[PDB]
Amino acid sequence: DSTTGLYAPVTPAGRVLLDRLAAHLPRIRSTAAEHDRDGTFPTDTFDALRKDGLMGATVPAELGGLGVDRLYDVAVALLAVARADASTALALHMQLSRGLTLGYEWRHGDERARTLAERILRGMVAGDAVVCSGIKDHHTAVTTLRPDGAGGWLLSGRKTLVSMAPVGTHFVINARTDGTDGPPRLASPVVTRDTPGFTVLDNWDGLGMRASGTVDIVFDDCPIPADHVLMRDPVGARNDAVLAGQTVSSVSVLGVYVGVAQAAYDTAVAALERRPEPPQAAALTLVAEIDSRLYALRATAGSALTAADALSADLSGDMDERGRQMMRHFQCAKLAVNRLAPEIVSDCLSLVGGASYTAGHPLARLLRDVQAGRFMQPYAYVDAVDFLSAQALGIERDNNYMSTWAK
Ligand SMILES: Cc1cn([C@H]2C[C@H](O)[C@@H](COP(=O)(O)OP(=O)(O)O[C@@H]3C[C@](C)(N)C(O)(O)[C@@H](C)O3)O2)c(=O)[nH]c1=O
Secondary structure, three states, X not given: OOOOOOOOOOOHHHHHHHHHHHOOHHHHHHOHHHHHHHOOOOHHHHHHHHHOOHHHOOOOHHHOOOOOOOHHHHHHHHHHHHHHOHHHHHHHHHHHXXXXXXXXXXXXXXXXXXXXXXXXXXXXXXXXXXXXXXXXEOOOOOOEEEEOOOOOEEEEEEEEEEOOHHHOOEEEEOEEEOOOOOOOEEEEEEEEOOOOOEEEOOOOOOOOOOOOOOEEEEEEEEEEXXXXXXXXXXXXXXXXXXXXXXXXXXXXXXXXXXXXXXXXXXXXXXXXHOOOOOOOHHHHHHHHHHHHHHXXXXXXXXXXXXXHHHHHHOOOOOHHHHHHHHHHHHHHHHHHHHHHHHHHHHHXXXXXXXXXXXXXXXXXXXXXXXXXXXXXXXXXXXXXXXXXXXXXXXXXXXXXXXXXXXX
């Protein structure tokens, strides 16, 4: 019955998601070290989740999905998976996040939007759609959509860091229009794996998250129909209202780092309890410091998730304010998660001692994986500080990171 600290799902659908996942932990857990050493994606893990209905966990119930719709419960499930393997959890988050955001498109967007959403969502439930996300351009390229002169579009460019890509059937891509007449827009084409000119590379070589499939994808004159395109707003047109969607789509990933911290602790404590001698002064002191820091990490992520779910559900008010507040809870918590979670994992290696310094020890992988959140937008630390200090001091700024990137 816990409602804090991400200790338990707060809804019956979240409870099912977590009980169902339990069945896959032994596989996820078992191929973790091999996939980390090789830098390869656990495709058999994802085949099993697909067949089990789990890749449709956040599709509305109305469409055949489990209907998990709390970010809190997604975070709880991701925390559980990340305790078994962080890379799998991170890949799964892209899919569960999409269930939530496509859900929103389905209930609230225009007819093109609702129709695309509904078709992808039903595919997610069926095990036919595995939806990847491509936001950041490779340095060599600016990803653009140009009119084909015939109703549809041609997508050229390259995205870097596209987790789950080796198994993705659908790729939601951040692109800017060009060669029309409007000021450039933000646009989200959806590319299917068999679109021509679309290539999935195999160049993911990570410090951590080595098994997350986080490769580049290339678009070369890719034909995209007009109705497979979610049009966004003009580049640099400031509406804080977009911040809500950008909170929905990443905030629950915080649970991955909370689970990595939890797994480091569980490992350290199991290591101490397996020892002949009674723990030393500094070992007892570390264990209490980590117990407390893990509690604060869980409560800070749990609390922002709770708040986000409440702000998310309320569409009655000022939508710009809703956006600002969502992003505020998310980024205040993220900054804390990105300091507490690596520090907890690092202190656990102090408890275990030099055994943790061999490539194969579980802590050695958790130390590497736990750093990943520091590099995920919105926002990495340097950008988080510009956003938070602007909010705190009421400084007007373009808070859309993709809008900025398009500049
Ligand atoms: C305004 C609003 C939008 N939305 C939704 C509908 C839009 O499709 C979406 C726009 O969000 P967003 O602009 O974040 O786009 P996205 O396609 O989700 O991309 C993200 C990028 C990220 C964070 N790196 C990720 O890879 O982890 C993945 C999973 O996706 O946000 C809401 O759910 N609630 C809202 O109140």
